[PDB]
């Protein structure tokens, strides 16, 4: 048993936008967890990703669901 979601998030996590985003994030992440005192949060960056990811997640996910 495999969740069509996770599979479709695999493909989607590869679309140009995701990548150009997933990257933007990865940096910020290790850009904030690299310092001791910083107010920055990588939420924004996180969204941009998600926003993009799930967007196609939707364009296709419901196709494999009954």
């Amino acid at each position: 048993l495999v969740d069509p979601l996770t599979t479709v998030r695999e493909q989607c996590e590869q679309l140009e936008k995701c990548v150009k985003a997933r990257e933007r994030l990865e940096l910020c992440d290790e850009r904030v967890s690299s310092r001791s005192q910083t107010e920055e949060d990588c939420t924004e960056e996180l969204f941009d990703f998600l926003h993009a990811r799930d967007h196609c997640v939707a364009h296709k996910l419901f196709n494999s669901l009954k």
């Binding site: 048993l1 969740d3 069509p4 990588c42 939420t43 924004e44 939707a58 419901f62 669901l65």
Partner: protein, 241 residues
């Protein structure tokens, strides 16, 4: 920071102004509610009664409601007493009262899911997302003891732990009970739940639209037919000189 993430749109089987709800899906949607949400989430405005003819069978729902005992009226000696849930009972409340529930859910109040779908902008799209969508808080961001990060929820810290994973149940119809899948079915239910009229309401809308289509022109002709007397008309000023 009033910073939030807005839920992506899923082509639900019932989105179309002319598309009903996949009743099969609701059936499962029901089961997922009954078997996993109806232990934290009250749903006071529905009742087995409904299920009959919409996703369940009379005998089906009846025995379905038997499945629960309900506190009922005074004795002769006057005392609440339990007894088999009839057909007309409303879906069981998990907690005697809110503050009771709040003391059961790490200080939070699992909202009743009767009108949930239309109580939160986004409906299913939101709800679905919310469920299928938890994850580690990005950096610099820290959720406190007892809460669980979920980007889609305002505050990103929810008091509800991810209540849905693969297999959590087993749709007796033979449906890959994957998270995404079940989570879908729960939402299609939450919809009907929120507005059983759905179909009846759209079908209606259909006809309503075919009458406008038919009636308005008719009366338009009539309106023009009648005005032509004027539209046509012609003036002229003829003094004697």
């Amino acid at each position: 920071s009033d910073l939030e993430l807005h839920p992506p749109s899923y082509p639900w089987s019932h989105r179309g102004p002319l598309s009903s709800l996949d009743h099969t899906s609701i059936r499962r949607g029901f089961q997922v509610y009954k078997q996993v949400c109806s232990s934290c989430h009250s749903m006071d405005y529905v009742a087995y009664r409904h299920l009959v003819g919409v996703c369940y069978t009379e005998d089906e729902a009846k025995a379905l409601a038997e499945e629960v005992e309900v506190q009922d009226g005074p004795n002769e000696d006057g005392e609440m007493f339990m007894r088999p849930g009839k057909l007309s009972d409303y879906f069981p409340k998990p907690y005697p009262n809110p503050e009771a529930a709040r003391a059961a859910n790490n200080g939070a109040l699992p909202p009743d899911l009767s009108y949930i779908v239309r109580a939160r902008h986004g409906g299913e799209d939101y709800v679905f997302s919310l469920l299928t969508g938890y994850c580690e808080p990005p950096t610099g961001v820290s959720v406190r003891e007892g809460l669980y990060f979920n980007p889609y929820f305002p505050g990103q810290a929810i008091g509800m732990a991810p209540p849905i994973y693969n297999d959590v149940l087993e749709f007796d119809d033979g449906t890959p009970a994957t998270m995404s899948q079940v989570a879908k079915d729960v939402c299609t239910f939450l919809r009907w739940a929120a507005e059983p009229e759905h179909d009846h309401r759209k079908r209606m809308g259909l006809k309503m639209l075919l009458m406008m289509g038919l009636l308005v022109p008719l009366v338009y002709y009539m309106k023009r037919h009648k005005w032509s007397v004027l539209k046509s008309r012609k003036l002229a000023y003829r003094p004697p000189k």
